[PDB]
Design a protein around this ligand. Sequence first.
Ligand SMILES: Cc1ccc(C[C@H](CO)Nc2ncnc3[nH]ccc23)cc1C
Ligand SMILES: [Cl-]
Length: 167
Amino acid sequence: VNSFSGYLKLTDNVYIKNADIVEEAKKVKPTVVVNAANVYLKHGGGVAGALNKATNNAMQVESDDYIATNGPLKVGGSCVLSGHNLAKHCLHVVGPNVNKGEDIQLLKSAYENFNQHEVLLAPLLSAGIFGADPIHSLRVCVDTVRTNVYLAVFDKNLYDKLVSSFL
Ligand SMILES: Cc1ccc(C[C@H](CO)Nc2ncnc3[nH]ccc23)cc1C
Ligand SMILES: [Cl-]
């Protein structure tokens, strides 16, 4: 039993809700919140911009030190950093950005990172400003993630389409 509330159950392990991941994380304080990261961990907009703003830029400061030491992530890759005031940990995951021409097949590799964590709060990878079809992203999530994932969808209209169209 966990403290996530108001989710619709899609499969044994995947759940979904129309919610603001920033507000969800502050309420639940999950063990792991997933960020929709880029390889440079530059959290300028989208989910990453919102999560970083909620940390008062501490996420960006930590991320800049990470990159200075380790260099950029891979598309499809991830790193574990602090969750600051939002969660114990933040799993920064790089889904392909279609608006950069990045291969959408890497979306499965991106979701595989979730399997290293028993329970996660997450957005749909490569959705929003990353340009992928959220219906495809949800399908890949369900077919790739085996651990317990609580998916937060900010937009109410989009959530209804994902649910009504879920096979
Ligand atoms: C119009 C529109 C907006 C957003 C999305 C999803 C992306 C992630 O898939 N953004 C987010 N998802 C969850 N919480 C969030 N908080 C801040 C940003 C954000 C899709 C579409 C079509
Ligand atoms: Cl977004």
